[PDB]
């Protein structure tokens, strides 16, 4: 799945078809995914696999015909998106991030960051009077 949490995978070499899987795990567990205060602050928090980001990168790399040297031999799994919703007014704030050239120490065997980081953001509005200009 590249999901950073596994699925069951099997072959039954009896018939010509043989393979089967179960996606037992829908999300990686143990990630603090909602923050709230009873005053009226609340959040939806979102998280994504480095292997998935790299698949997007590799897709673009080969669209450029470039050579893959994004050396990062591990699917770390990382923050992707968050929404903050105002419990009172029902407006909200959208913020999202992306990153490229995940990086690794081939001698010390350790993480070395990303080559590039990107952020985007808008509110969402209870309001068309506000056109966002993201």
């Amino acid at each position: 799945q590249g999901l950073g949490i596994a699925s069951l995978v099997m072959t039954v070499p009896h018939m010509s078809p043989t393979h089967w899987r179960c996606d037992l795990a829908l999300n990686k567990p143990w990630l603090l995914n909602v923050m709230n205060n009873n005053r009226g602050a609340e959040t939806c928090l979102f998280y994504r696999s480095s292997a998935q980001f790299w698949l997007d990168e590799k897709q673009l790399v080969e669209a450029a015909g470039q050579q893959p040297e994004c050396h990062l031999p591990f699917p770390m799994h990382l923050h992707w998106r968050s929404e903050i919703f105002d419990e009172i007014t029902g407006n909200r704030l959208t913020q999202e991030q992306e990153y490229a050239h995940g990086s690794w120490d081939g001698q010390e065997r350790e993480f070395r960051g990303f080559g590039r980081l990107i952020q985007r953001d808008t509110d969402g509005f209870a309001q068309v009077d506000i056109p966002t200009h993201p």
Partner: protein, 34 residues
């Protein structure tokens, strides 16, 4: 000089578990009058 001793074949393929692919090869003729 060169003469054929033996031959074998290999097929990059996918096969059913118990699928016995069926095919055959034959020689029509050969040089050097063998």
């Amino acid at each position: 000089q060169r003469r054929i001793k033996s031959v074998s074949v290999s097929l990059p393929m996918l096969v059913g578990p118990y699928e016995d692919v069926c095919a055959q090869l034959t020689q029509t003729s050969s040089s050097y009058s063998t």
